[PDB]
């Protein structure tokens, strides 16, 4: 085939791979931030559900 075909194919492959590398580094940074802050959807370790708490009148007035 023509050389220009391989030229364009190389350009496309380079773009795809470079974008993949950018995304991988971005993912690593995002993961570190989320695991160090817990401010993202990832690494949300469970906590006690407030629904379990009962607010009905107890026996002793001072709870």
């Amino acid at each position: 085939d023509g050389p220009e075909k391989n030229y364009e194919k190389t350009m496309a492959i380079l773009q795809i791979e470079a974008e993949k590398a950018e995304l991988r580094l971005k993912e690593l940074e995002v993961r570190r931030l989320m695991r160090a802050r817990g401010d993202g959807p990832w690494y949300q370790y469970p906590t006690i559900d407030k629904a379990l708490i009962d607010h009905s009148p107890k026996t002793t007035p001072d709870n």
Partner: protein, 169 residues
């Protein structure tokens, strides 16, 4: 066929034959025999094949590449532009190598042609080759096996910094 400008061949100066001896030169008779028995049939065959070629006359063209932004005008991680520039640089590298080869061919042809007077009659060719050698070496040398356009850029930048330091002193 080739460009005599690219491949300079000084005009031939063959001396006129002036025999001073009655004895017939064997070389002349041998050359006549060789012409008649070899050159003639060879030329006839060449003519026939040339006719055949003239019948089937087709042309092949020379591909020309447009200039592409150099690695200097390229972003840090712009792989597309970097690929374009690197391919351009490699093409220019090949062209420079071929230029060196052309000048070397000139030098060798001069060495043979001028015979014993080669030392005095090839000064221009030697100077040309020296210039081309210096330029090629400064541009492309010590880059390494994994040479790249970025490497030539780095070498040029280092050279320019050294030049600045020297000029400042």
């Amino acid at each position: 066929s080739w460009d005599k400008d690219v491949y300079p061949e000084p005009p031939r100066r063959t001396p006129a034959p002036a025999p001073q001896t009655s004895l017939p030169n064997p070389v002349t008779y041998l050359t006549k025999i060789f012409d008649l028995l070899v050159d003639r049939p060879v030329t006839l065959a060449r003519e026939f094949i040339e006719q055949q070629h003239a019948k089937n006359r087709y042309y092949y063209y020379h591909r020309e590449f447009r200039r592409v932004p150099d690695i200097t005008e390229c972003e840090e991680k712009d792989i597309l532009c970097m690929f374009e520039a690197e391919m351009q640089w490699r093409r220019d590298y090949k062209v420079d190598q071929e230029i060196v080869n052309i000048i070397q061919e000139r030098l060798k042809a001069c060495q043979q042609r001028e015979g014993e007077s080669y030392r005095q009659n090839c000064a221009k060719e030697l100077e040309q080759f020296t210039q081309v050698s210096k330029a090629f070496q400064d541009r492309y040398s010590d880059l390494g096996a994994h040479y790249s356009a970025r490497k030539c850029l780095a070498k040029q930048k280092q050279r320019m910094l050294a030049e600045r330091k020297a000029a400042k002193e």
